Amino acid sequence: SVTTPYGISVSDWIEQTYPKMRIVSAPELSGVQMKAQEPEDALVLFVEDVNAAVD
Amino acid sequence: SVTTPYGISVSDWIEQTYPKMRIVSAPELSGVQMKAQEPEDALVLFVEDVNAAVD
Amino acid sequence: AVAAAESERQESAASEMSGEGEVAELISQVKAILARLEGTA
Amino acid sequence: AVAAAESERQESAASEMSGEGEVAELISQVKAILARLEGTA
Amino acid sequence: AVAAAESERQESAASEMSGEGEVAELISQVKAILARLEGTA
Amino acid sequence: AVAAAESERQESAASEMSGEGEVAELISQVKAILARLEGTA
Amino acid sequence: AVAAAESERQESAASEMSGEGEVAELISQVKAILARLEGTA
């Protein structure tokens, strides 16, 4: 929801750039690692399914 | 309906950020409390319903 | 009956949520009606 | 009542507002017609 | 058919209107076809 | 069917046009299917 | 039941895509149901 100072959110950028991009948020992806005491948060970008025709 | 000086409303930001967020305005939610003489106006964000399968 | 009531209810909710959300929810309810039409026949 | 004059009144109204509201009301009227189609069968 | 020609014209016009105008005219014509579907049965 | 294959090709092509073009082409194909439904009955 | 499973999985997938993608996927599913309705009759 962070917006550039003119009013375009990161969500708007995704909508106008990757319209069919599935976006989910999971509690277990927060604090995956600890650098020294700060719980490192995670982002995972992955293809869900791949068609069986090509391979 | 208040905008940035470049033509993006708060409603537009909600549209592009939380498109399915219900927005209602109630007469009884205005002037809920008193600071000293100024009727304090309120905002309540809440989940409507929670599915019963999870719990 | 109960189905129609639920439809009307979700419709009034889908009238108070932005424009993209409203259009998405209305199209989803439309598709639910078409799925019911398929189920009848 | 007549169910047609009200439909044209809603059509005029929807065409008179802005684009998102017009598309929302048109899909709502489409849903109403689909629900009446379900009710007939 | 007369109706066929009418629909074809509507399409040609909506295709050369802008995006929201097109997405509104197409749903208006879809609603017209749905009204005809209700009328026939 | 020939019509089925044609509609599949239309969908595939629409999937690569931008969002407004996507929704316009999909609604146009929906209108074509509804017109064929009217023609059958 | 297979078509219902496909429709519900596609609804869950399209729920969290952005607004344009959600509308596009929902309209594509609506058209799929219309094509199936055409095939049945």
CB atoms near residue G3 (< 10 Å): 13
Buried/exposed code over A9-26 (b: 16+ C-beta within 10 A; e: otherwise): bebbebbeeebbeeeeee
Pairwise CB contact (< 8 Å): E24 & D29: no
Percentages (nearest 5) of helix, strand, coil residues in chain F: 85, 0, 15
Q: Which of F24, F35, F41 minimises the CB distance to E26?
A: F24
**Coil, helix or strand for C3?**
helix
Amino acid of residue D1: A
Find the chain E residues whose C-beta atoms sit closer than 8 A to any C-beta of F.
7, 11, 15, 19-20, 22-23, 26-27, 29-30, 33-34, 36-37, 40-41
Q: Using a CB-CB distance cutoff of 8 angstroms, which residues of chain C are in contact with residue B21?
A: 17-18, 21
Mention every residue, 6+ apart, whose C-beta is less than 8 A from residue E11: E26, E29, F28, F31
| Closest to F33 (Cα-Cα) out of G26, E29, C40, D4 | E29
PDB resolution in Å: 2.9
For residues F39 and G36, the answer to whether their CB atoms sit within 8 Å is no
Burial readout B8-45 (b: 16 or more C-beta within 10 A, e: otherwise): beeebbbbbbbbbeeeeeeeeeeeeeeeeeeeeeeeee
Residues of chain D positioned with their CB less than 8 A from the CB of C11: 28, 31
How distant is the alpha carbon of residue F22 from its chain centre?
A: 10
**Is G39 in CB contact (< 8 Å) with chain A?**
no
| Amino acid found at E7 | S
Chain B hits for A13, CB-CB cut-off 8 Å, are none
Measured between alpha carbons, how far is B43 from B52 in angstroms, rounded to an integer?
27
C chain contacts of residue G7, beta-carbon cutoff 8 Å: 31, 35
- Method of determination is cryo-EM
